[PDB]
Amino acid sequence: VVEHPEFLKAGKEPGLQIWRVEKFDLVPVPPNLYGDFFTGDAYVILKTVQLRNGNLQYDLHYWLGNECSQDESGAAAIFTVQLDDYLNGRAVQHREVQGFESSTFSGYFKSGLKYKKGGVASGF
Amino acid sequence: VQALVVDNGSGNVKAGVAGDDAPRSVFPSIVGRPKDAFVGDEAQTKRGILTLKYPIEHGIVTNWDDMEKIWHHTFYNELRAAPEEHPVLLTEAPLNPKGNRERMTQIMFESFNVPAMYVAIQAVLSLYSSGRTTGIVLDSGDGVSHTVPIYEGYALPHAIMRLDLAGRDLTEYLMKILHERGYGFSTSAEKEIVRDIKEKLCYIALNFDEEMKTSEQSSDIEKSYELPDGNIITVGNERFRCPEALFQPSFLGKEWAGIHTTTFNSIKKCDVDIRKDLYGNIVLSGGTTMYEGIGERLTRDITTLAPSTMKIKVVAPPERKYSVWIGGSILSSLSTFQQMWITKEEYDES
Numbered sequence: 073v074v075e076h077p078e079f080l081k082a083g084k085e086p087g088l089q090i091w092r093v094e095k096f097d098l099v100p101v102p103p104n105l106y107g108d109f110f111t112g113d114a115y116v117i118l119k120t121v122q123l124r125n126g127n128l129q130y131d132l133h134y135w136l137g138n139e140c141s142q143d144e145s146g147a148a149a150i151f152t153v154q155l156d157d158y159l160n161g162r163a164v165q166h167r168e169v170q171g172f173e174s175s176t177f178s179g180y181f182k183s184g185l186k187y188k189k190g191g192v193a194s195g196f
Numbered sequence: 197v198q199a200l201v202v203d204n205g206s207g208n209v210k211a212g213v214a215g216d217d218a219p220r221s222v223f224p225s226i227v228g229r230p231k232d233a234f235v236g237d238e239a240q241t242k243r244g245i246l247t248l249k250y251p252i253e254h255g256i257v258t259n260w261d262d263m264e265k266i267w268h269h270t271f272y273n274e275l276r277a278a279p280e281e282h283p284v285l286l287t288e289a290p291l292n293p294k295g296n297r298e299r300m301t302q303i304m305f306e307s308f309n310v311p312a313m314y315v316a317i318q319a320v321l322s323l324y325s326s327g328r329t330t331g332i333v334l335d336s337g338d339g340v341s342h343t344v345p346i347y348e349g350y351a352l353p354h355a356i357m358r359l360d361l362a363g364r365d366l367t368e369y370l371m372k373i374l375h376e377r378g379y380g381f382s383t384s385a386e387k388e389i390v391r392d393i394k395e396k397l398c399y400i401a402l403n404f405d406e407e408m409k410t411s412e413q414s415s416d417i418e419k420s421y422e423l424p425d426g427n428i429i430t431v432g433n434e435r436f437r438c439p440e441a442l443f444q445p446s447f448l449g450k451e452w453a454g455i456h457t458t459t460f461n462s463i464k465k466c467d468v469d470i471r472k473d474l475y476g477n478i479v480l481s482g483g484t485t486m487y488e489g490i491g492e493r494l495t496r497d498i499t500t501l502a503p504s505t506m507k508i509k510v511v512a513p514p515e516r517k518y519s520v521w522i523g524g525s526i527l528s529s530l531s532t533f534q535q536m537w538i539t540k541e542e543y544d545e546s
């Protein structure tokens with residue numbers, strides 16, 4: 073389970089990658105929007121860190137908006153598992169619920185976490 | 197091409213197409229043969245001229261000829277789909293033997309000629325349908341209940357618990373205790389009526405002993421139900437004594453652990469460093485988890501059993517009756533599903 077183009081880009085360099093679940097697919101979030109999340113949507117976030125020994129460390133977070141649809145939150149969970157598998161299981165997985173996110177997750181965004189009304193339509 | 201999703205339930209098959217939010221076909225997992233095979237509702241309407249059998253009584257397929265009849269009915273009579281032209285996602289019970297999975301795979305590829313298939317564990321699909329990768333699923337269906345710890349997407353096989361106590365046992369117990377007020381439900385057709393009584397009127401007491409006390413103090417407990425023949429039946433404390441057997445199997449003459457104890461035992465089989473995530477994500481699945489009061493009661497009872505440092509959260513999704521099927525519909529819709537399945541060509545050359 074590797075041929076997905078976004079899997080091929082995941083975790084190659086230190087940094088922050090955010091995808092939104094859109095109609096049962098993983099779609100990159102425009103970087104200008106990083107830190108702002110639609111309450112109607114679910115997202116997958118991969119934080120990649122360069123270790124002292126040169127290896128890479130991975131934290132996968134799936135973020136669930138208060139109004140996201142069941143297909144979106146279920147897909148975010150499943151894509152998280154599949155991305156971890158593609159990273160040979162070395163990612164630590166984190167469930168993030170709107171308004172109750174971990175301090176680690178909020179710390180990824182210099183401007184802090186903000187939410188917006190709306191979102192992409194359900195696949196259901 | 198759109199995958200078909202088939203949840204092989206002990207009591208009912210749930211079937212439909214990937215991308216739907218609910219199964220479009222739900223029918224009883226019954227095959228009737230003359231006293232040359234009838235399946236599902238049509239088998240029940242002809243119970244006079246047929247012997248009826250359950251091929252998957254306790255979540256495990258045990259009669260493969262009859263199971264193949266159920267699958268043929270699913271594809272041809274319910275969905276009107278050519279199985280040889282769709283990928284199929286099939287569900288299986290937790291701890292299903294690999295030899296059973298191989299037999300279902302052989303039938304799909306060699307009898308139905310399915311082009312591709314994927315077998316999913318029911319409880320894992322339910323966890324995904326709840327938007328989680330880690331948690332413990334308590335799936336209570338018709339013929340079987342399981343508690344299934346799952347960590348970062350995968351079930352922990354050494355910690356799964358099976359309890360052969362589920363909805364059908366509760367229906368039978370309600371049939372039994374209604375003899376106290378003079379009812380003699382006993383036939384297969386009467387059992388279906390009592391099942392409906394159970395679903396409509398029963399509930400789970402927050403504290404069983406206190407509910408027995410309060411219910412005896414007045415007639416407020418009594419609720420009515422209109423039978424097919426127009427007669428009205430009144431049910432009192434049977435409303436919560438029936439599902440109480442989930443917690444006290446001694447009511448059925450069994451020394452088995454109740455569902456709270458079973459959930460606790462399952463979590464304890466997992467290493468201490470992940471138990472907090474399981475206790476905080478106890479996810480209910482299946483028709484027999486639909487009773488009013490179940491989440492509140494399970495929360496009390498598991499909180500009592502578990503160390504007091506743990507944070508107990510019981511999650512009762514509104515559409516949990518079909519959460520296995522829904523999880524399958526999501527998984528088989530993803531852009532990555534085509535990489536997860538086995539093709540017929542691979543199988544045939546294996």
Ligand SMILES: Nc1ncnc2c1ncn2[C@@H]1O[C@H](COP(=O)(O)OP(=O)(O)OP(=O)(O)O)[C@@H](O)[C@H]1O
Nearest residue numbers: 205206207208337338339340363395482483484486
């Ligand atoms: N609202 C309800 N309250 C109580 N029980 C219910 C309710 N709705 C359905 N049930 C029971 O749920 C059971 C069927 O649910 P399900 O179909 O999820 O079991 P299965 O999946 O068919 O069998 P298994 O999963 O055990 O192999 C039946 O026994 C039915 O009576």
Ligand SMILES: [Ca+2]
Nearest residue numbers: 112113191192
């Ligand atoms: Ca949305």
Ligand SMILES: [Ca+2]
Nearest residue numbers: 156161162163
């Ligand atoms: Ca991992």
Ligand SMILES: [Cl-]
Nearest residue numbers: 499500502504
């Ligand atoms: Cl305690």
Ligand SMILES: [K+]
Nearest residue numbers: 335336337340
């Ligand atoms: K079950």
Ligand SMILES: [Mg+2]
Nearest residue numbers: 205206337482
């Ligand atoms: Mg089931």
Ligand code: NA
Nearest residue numbers: 472475476507
């Ligand atoms: Na906890």
